[PDB]
Amino acid sequence: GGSVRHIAIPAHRGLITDRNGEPLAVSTPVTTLWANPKELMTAKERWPQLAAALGQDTKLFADRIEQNAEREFIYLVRGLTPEQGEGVIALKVPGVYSIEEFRRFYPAGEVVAHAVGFTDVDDRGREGIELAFDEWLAGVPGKRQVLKDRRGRVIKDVQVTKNAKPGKTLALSIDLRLQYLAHRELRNALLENGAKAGSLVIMDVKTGEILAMTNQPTYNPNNRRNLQPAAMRNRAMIDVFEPGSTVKPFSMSAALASGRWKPSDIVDVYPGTLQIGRYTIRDVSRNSRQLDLTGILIKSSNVGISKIAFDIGAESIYSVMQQVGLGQDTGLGFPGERVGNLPNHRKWPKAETATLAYGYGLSVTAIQLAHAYAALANDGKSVPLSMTRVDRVPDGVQVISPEVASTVQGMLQQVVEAQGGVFRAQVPGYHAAGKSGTARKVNAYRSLFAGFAPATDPRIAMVVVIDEPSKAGYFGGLVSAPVFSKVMAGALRLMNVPPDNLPTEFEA
Numbered sequence: 001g002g003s004v005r006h007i008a009i010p011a012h013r014g015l016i017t018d019r020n021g022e023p024l025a026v027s028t029p030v031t032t033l034w035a036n037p038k039e040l041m042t043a044k045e046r047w048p049q050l051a052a053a054l055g056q057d058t059k060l061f062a063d064r065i066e067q068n069a070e071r072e073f074i075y076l077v078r079g080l081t082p083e084q085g086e087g088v089i090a091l092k093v094p095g096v097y098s099i100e101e102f103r104r105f106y107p108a109g110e111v112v113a114h115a116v117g118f119t120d121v122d123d124r125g126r127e128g129i130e131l132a133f134d135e136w137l138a139g140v141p142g143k144r145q146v147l148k149d150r151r152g153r154v155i156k157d158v159q160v161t162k163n164a165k166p167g168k169t170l171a172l173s174i175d176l177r178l179q180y181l182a183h184r185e186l187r188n189a190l191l192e193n194g195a196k197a198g199s200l201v202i203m204d205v206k207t208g209e210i211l212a213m214t215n216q217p218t219y220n221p222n223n224r225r226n227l228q229p230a231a232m233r234n235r236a237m238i239d240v241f242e243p244g245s246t247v248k249p250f251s252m253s254a255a256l257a258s259g260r261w262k263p264s265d266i267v268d269v270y271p272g273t274l275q276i277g278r279y280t281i282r283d284v285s286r287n288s289r290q291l292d293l294t295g296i297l298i299k300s301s302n303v304g305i306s307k308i309a310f311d312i313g314a315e316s317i318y319s320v321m322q323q324v325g326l327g328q329d330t331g332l333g334f335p336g337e338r339v340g341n342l343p344n345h346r347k348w349p350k351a352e353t354a355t356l357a358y359g360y361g362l363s364v365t366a367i368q369l370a371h372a373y374a375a376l377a378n379d380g381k382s383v384p385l386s387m388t389r390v391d392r393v394p395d396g397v398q399v400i401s402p403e404v405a406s407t408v409q410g411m412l413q414q415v416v417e418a419q420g421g422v423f424r425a426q427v428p429g430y431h432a433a434g435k436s437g438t439a440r441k442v443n444a445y446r447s448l449f450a451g452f453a454p455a456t457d458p459r460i461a462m463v464v465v466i467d468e469p470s471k472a473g474y475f476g477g478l479v480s481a482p483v484f485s486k487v488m489a490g491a492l493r494l495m496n497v498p499p500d501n502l503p504t505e506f507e508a
């Protein structure tokens with residue numbers, strides 16, 4: 001007797017590695033016990049011992065089987081060892097079956113959870129890379145012919161009609177060594193500042209590769225028990241924030257490209273405030289009069305950058321920030337990734353011109369901010385972003401001219417190295433460049449640092465975001481700059497970049 005039926009052959013999900021082959025998401029065998037209730041209903045005498053072997057109350061187990069008496073498949077328990085599955089099979093209960101199924105394990109756990117994401121119990125990607133590249137990773141299930149008796153029990157395997165096709169291996173752009181370093185130091189910074197959250201992005205300025213992307217809080221994707229959704233946010237891609245002063249190098253790029261400004265030109269910022277009708281632009285350091293363009297960045301003078309913006313026009317500044325990608329679609333396609341907002345106007349009055357120029361009222365992601373600094377470091381050329389390992393580098397787009405980019409690079413090196421600069425961002429053994437930011441949330445603060453290294457031949461761009469530090473310190477040059485120093489120092493050494501901060505003949 002029996003009936004001819006076709007059943008599926010699950011496909012083996014593809015391995016996800018870092019850029020060097022280190023396993024990040026692996027489908028490994030676990031032993032699973034399942035049951036056909038229609039068969040179980042013929043051997044009720046065996047139920048209590050089966051319940052006991054499954055750690056179930058006898059009556060709760062007997063109730064569950066009765067409530068599913070019309071189904072032909074229920075799970076008993078998933079994730080045993082082969083030895084554990086055999087002990088239950090040794091009861092020889094009709095309708096109880098053991099199978100080996102491949103389920104996801106994440107060997108680096110919380111360290112790359114936001115980037116990698118996870119699959120559901122149907123093993124379909126639902127977060128992070130697992131979702132974004134689900135088609136690549138999933139493969140194609142097969143089909144095989146069976147004969148089933150009246151209860152649904154397979155009584156003969158007839159033939160395979162189509163073989164399963166396994167999913168494909170995927171190598172991410174992430175370097176797990178940099179990821180671990182970034183993860184540990186971001187975690188340390190949250191403790192030292194009693195901060196609520198944070199992000200750290202590392203990018204290869206020559207290839208567009210996202211070398212590291214970590215956030216706090218994070219979660220263990222191997223133990224998703226009562227996960228708070230806040231811990232699951234890949235903030236670097238799905239949270240927007242005001243970049244504030246960290247956009248001032250792009251305002252400065254527009255200034256230098258206009259033909260009306262050189263680094264040694266001077267701006268009077270006395271007395272540290274600038275009234276624009278009912279609005280008042282304010283500096284924190286208000287013991288300045290004449291500042292040159294590098295000093296405007298070193299002191300992070302909102303007044304100074306605003307006066308420059310009045311001279312060159314907001315349109316030139318908006319265009320640079322648009323070109324380097326701030327508030328613009330990255331095109332990556334990460335689930336929930338935000339585009340943000342670069343505010344636009346028909347005509348730009350002084351107030352809107354000033355706030356644009358020092359990053360007030362803008363919305364960007366940490367990925368966008370890092371990509372913009374990568375283009376600046378790469379002599380003004382923006383290489384497309386990638387979450388996967390890049391073997392053939394695609395052509396970039398020139399978004400800032402090489403001469404202007406090179407001059408702004410040198411100014412940003414001075415921001416880190418010059419007297420009164422952001423000395424905590426200095427990278428031991430290397431010349432580094434960057435810009436701090438401190439944004440008041442609308443007192444709560446967000447502490448920023450963005451930069452790149454080595455200055456002589458940039459390789460890595462990095463953004464550090466510390467959300468709501470609660471200690472006495474909250475300025476970006478105190479809170480986020482030291483994280484940049486430690487992570488950049490380690491990342492450059494892990495990538496075997498030759499140190500470039502060597503004495504001249506006279507300094508030796």
Ligand SMILES: *C(=O)[C@@H](NC(=O)/C(=N\OC(C)(C)C(=O)O)c1csc(N)n1)[C@@H]1N=C(C(=O)O)C(=C)CS1
Pocket residue numbers: 242243244245246283284285299300302358359360361435436437438439440441442445475476477
């Ligand atoms: C650049 O980020 C500048 N930040 C600001 O003007 C902002 N806030 O300034 C503080 C002092 C935090 C305030 O409470 O007003 C700002 C920009 S967008 C936003 N929502 N707030 C300057 N940056 C620095 C740095 O280099 O971190 C300073 C040292 C002084 S303020």
